[PDB]
C-alpha cells in the first residue's frame, strides 16, 4: 500500500457504496415475468439471436425449474424472453442508481449532471457488475437462485458482449479494481448533456490515478505488467459495446415495445 490518505479514502467510499447497493445474491429480485407456458426485421432477428441462453431457477426447497429457448422460426418466438430481460435490467439499474447516490463526489454534482451521467453509464456499470458473477469455465452468469447459461463454441466469442466478459474475467481483478472501473466509467466527462465537463473530468482523472497507484502497490507480478492499461482499453471497448447495444435496444423497442418505465427514462423515451 503506497496510496495517499485521500486515495485510501476514495477506495473505502467506493467499496462502501458497492457493499450497500450490490445485491450479490439477488435476494431481492422478485416478481419478475417469465416466458409463457421489413429489413428492419431481419435486423431485429439478427439483433436478438446473438444471445441465446437457457434459464435455471433453484427453489428455496430444492426443486429446479429449467427453461430451454425456441429455435428461430421466423415469428414472434424470439420475443418470449424480453419481459424477463427488462425486469432484470430494471432491478440492476436500481442498484446502480443507489450506488451513485451514496458516492459523495456524485452527490456534489448538480442534479442535471447526475442524470446525464447515470443515463450515460448505467448499462456499463451493470455489465461490470455482471462480470463478477460470470463463470467463464461454464459460460454462466450465476445470480443467486438463478442462472443464465450460454447455449451451444468459439464462434460464441465473436459476439463482442461475450468477448468482453471472457476477456475481463481473465484479468482476475480484485473487488477494489472493479469498483474503481465503475467510478471511472460513471464519471465520464463526455456523456451527452454533461455541464460540469471540467469537474467530472478531474474526478475521473483522480479515480484513474488511484487505480494505477493501487495496481503498482499490490500487483508486482510479471503477469500484471500493463494491467492498468489493459483495464483502460476494456473500458474503451465497453463504451463501444454500450453504444451498439443502445441502438439495438431502440430498434427492437421500435417494433416490439418491452422497455419498463425506468428503462424509458434512462434511454430518453418520453411516452409520446
Ligand atoms: C445474467 C445477464 C447477463 C447479461 C450479460 C450480457 O448482457 C450478456 C448477454 C446475455 C444475456 C443473458 C440474458 C438473457 C435473457 O434472455 C434474459 C436475461 O435476463 C439475461 C441476463 O439477465 O443476462
Swiss-Prot record:
Write out the residues that bind hyperforin.
Answer: 89, 127-130, 245
Keywords attached to this entry: Activator, DNA-binding, Metal-binding, Nucleus, Receptor, Transcription, Transcription regulation, Zinc, Zinc-finger
Tell me one GO molecular function of this protein.
RNA polymerase II transcription regulatory region sequence-specific DNA binding
Cell compartment(s), UniProt: Nucleus
Q: Name one GO biological process term.
A: intracellular receptor signaling pathway
Q: Can you state the subunit structure given in the record?
A: Heterodimer with RXR. Interacts with NCOA1. Interacts (via domain NR LBD) with CRY1 and CRY2 in a ligand-dependent manner.
- Give the family, as the similarity comment puts it: Belongs to the nuclear hormone receptor family. NR1 subfamily.
> What is the stated purpose of this protein?
Nuclear receptor that binds and is activated by variety of endogenous and xenobiotic compounds. Transcription factor that activates the transcription of multiple genes involved in the metabolism and secretion of potentially harmful xenobiotics, drugs and endogenous compounds. Activated by the antibiotic rifampicin and various plant metabolites, such as hyperforin, guggulipid, colupulone, and isoflavones. Response to specific ligands is species-specific. Activated by naturally occurring steroids, such as pregnenolone and progesterone.
The name under which this protein is listed is Nuclear receptor subfamily 1 group I member 2
- Species of origin: Homo sapiens
Q: What lineage, starting at the top, does this entry show?
A: Eukaryota, Metazoa, Chordata, Craniata, Vertebrata
> Gene name?
NR1I2
Which region of the full protein is contained in this chain? Answer: 141 to 434 of 434
Amino acid at each position: 500500500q503506497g496510496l495517499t490518505e485521500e486515495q485510501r479514502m476514495m477506495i473505502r467510499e467506493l467499496m462502501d457504496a458497492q457493499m450497500k447497493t450490490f445485491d450479490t445474491t439477488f435476494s431481492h429480485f422478485k416478481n419478475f415475468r417469465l416466458p409463457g407456458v421489413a429489413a428492419k426485421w431481419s435486423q431485429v432477428r439478427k439483433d436478438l439471436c446473438s444471445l441465446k441462453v437457457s434459464l435455471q431457477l433453484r427453489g428455496e426447497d430444492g426443486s429446479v425449474w429449467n427453461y430451454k429457448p425456441p429455435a428461430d422460426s421466423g415469428g414472434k418466438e424470439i420475443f418470449s424472453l424480453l419481459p424477463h430481460m427488462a425486469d432484470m435490467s430494471t432491478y440492476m439499474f436500481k442498484g446502480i442508481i443507489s450506488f451513485a447516490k451514496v458516492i459523495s463526489y456524485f452527490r456534489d454534482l448538480p442534479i442535471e449532471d447526475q442524470i446525464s451521467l447515470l443515463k450515460g453509464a448505467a448499462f456499463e456499470l451493470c455489465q461490470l457488475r455482471f462480470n463478477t458473477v460470470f463463470n467463464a469455465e461454464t459460460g454462466t452468469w450465476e445470480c443467486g437462485r438463478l442462472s443464465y447459461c450460454l447455449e451451444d463454441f468459439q464462434q460464441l466469442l465473436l459476439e463482442p458482449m461475450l468477448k468482453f466478459h471472457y476477456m475481463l474475467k481473465k484479468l482476475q481483478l480484485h473487488e477494489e479494481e472493479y469498483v474503481l472501473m465503475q467510478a471511472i466509467s460513471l464519471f465520464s466527462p463526455d456523456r451527452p448533456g454533461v455541464l460540469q465537463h471540467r469537474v467530472v473530468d478531474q474526478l475521473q482523472e483522480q479515480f484513474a490515478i488511484t487505480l494505477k497507484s493501487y495496481i503498482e502497490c499490490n500487483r508486482p507480478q510479471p503477469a500484471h505488467r500493463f494491467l492498468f492499461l489493459k483495464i483502460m482499453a476494456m473500458l474503451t471497448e465497453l463504451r463501444s459495446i454500450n453504444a451498439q447495444h443502445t441502438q439495438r435496444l431502440l430498434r427492437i423497442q421500435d417494433i416490439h415495445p418491452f422497455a419498463t418505465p425506468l428503462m424509458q427514462e434512462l434511454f430518453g423515451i418520453t411516452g409520446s
